[PDB]
Amino acid sequence: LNPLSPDIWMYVLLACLGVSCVLFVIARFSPYEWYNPHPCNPDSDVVENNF
Amino acid sequence: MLKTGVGVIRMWADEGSRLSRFRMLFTSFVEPPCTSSTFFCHSNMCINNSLVCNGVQNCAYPWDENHCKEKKKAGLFEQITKTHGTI
Ligand SMILES: CCCCCCCC/C=C\CCCCCCCC(=O)O[C@@H](COC(=O)CCCCCCCCCCCCCCC)COP(=O)([O-])OCC[N+](C)(C)C
Ligand SMILES: *[C@@H]1O[C@H](CO)[C@@H](O)[C@H](O)[C@H]1NC(C)=O
Structure with missing residues (x-):
C-alpha cells in the first residue's frame, strides 16, 4: 500500500x-x-437509461 | 577530570594576546553507584537528573541527551495544514 503516498490513495x-x-x-x-x-416492439415512448 | 570538588581555573593573557578566549562547562559528579536525583553515565558519573535533557553534554558521548524529542507520527494526518490537508 506504500508505492503511492496516502494523499494519492485519497x-x-x-x-x-x-x-x-x-x-x-x-x-x-x-x-x-x-x-x-x-x-x-419498436413503438412505445418507454426509452430507458441503463446508468 | 579533577580529583577534589574545588578547582582554580585561571587565564593569563598579555596586552597583545587579549582576544584569546575560552568557554567551559563544569559538572558535579559522584562514585558509580547512583541513586534517585542522580543519573548514571558510565566511567564514574552521578550527574543530577536535571542534567538529563539540559540541552548540553554533561558527560562523555551525549548519553544524558537522548530520547528527548517527541512531536508526532502520522500519515495524511501529519499534513492537515497548508499542505494537502486543504485540498
Ligand atoms: C462538473 C464539474 C467538472 C469538474 C470537477 C469534477 C469532479 C472531479 C473529481 C475529483 C476532483 C479532481 C481530482 C481530486 C482532487 C484534486 C487533486 C489535486 O492534487 O489537484 C490537481 C488539480 O487541482 C488543482 O490543484 C488546480 C490546478 C489548476 C489547473 C487544473 C485544471 C482544471 C481546469 C480545466 C481546464 C479546461 C480544459 C478544457 C480542455 C483543454 C492538481 O494539483 P497540483 O496543483 O498539480 O499539485 C501541486 C504540485 N506541487 C505540490 C508539487 C506544487
Ligand atoms: C539537583 O537535584 C534535583 C533533583 O532532585 C534537580 O532537579 C535540581 O535541579 C538540582 N538541585 C541543585 C541544588 O543542584
Whole structure:
C-alpha cells in the first residue's frame, strides 16, 4: 500500500466518487444515452437509461 | 577530570594576546553507584537528573541527551495544514 503516498490513495478514492457522479449526471442529461428498449416492439415512448 | 570538588581555573593573557578566549562547562559528579536525583553515565558519573535533557553534554558521548524529542507520527494526518490537508 506504500508505492503511492496516502494523499494519492485519497485522491484516487475521491476520483472514483468524483467521476461516477459526473458520469451519472451526464448520462441522464445526454439525450443519446436514453435508448429505446424492447426492439421486438419498436413503438412505445418507454426509452430507458441503463446508468 | 579533577580529583577534589574545588578547582582554580585561571587565564593569563598579555596586552597583545587579549582576544584569546575560552568557554567551559563544569559538572558535579559522584562514585558509580547512583541513586534517585542522580543519573548514571558510565566511567564514574552521578550527574543530577536535571542534567538529563539540559540541552548540553554533561558527560562523555551525549548519553544524558537522548530520547528527548517527541512531536508526532502520522500519515495524511501529519499534513492537515497548508499542505494537502486543504485540498
Ligand atoms: C462538473 C464539474 C467538472 C469538474 C470537477 C469534477 C469532479 C472531479 C473529481 C475529483 C476532483 C479532481 C481530482 C481530486 C482532487 C484534486 C487533486 C489535486 O492534487 O489537484 C490537481 C488539480 O487541482 C488543482 O490543484 C488546480 C490546478 C489548476 C489547473 C487544473 C485544471 C482544471 C481546469 C480545466 C481546464 C479546461 C480544459 C478544457 C480542455 C483543454 C492538481 O494539483 P497540483 O496543483 O498539480 O499539485 C501541486 C504540485 N506541487 C505540490 C508539487 C506544487
Ligand atoms: C539537583 O537535584 C534535583 C533533583 O532532585 C534537580 O532537579 C535540581 O535541579 C538540582 N538541585 C541543585 C541544588 O543542584
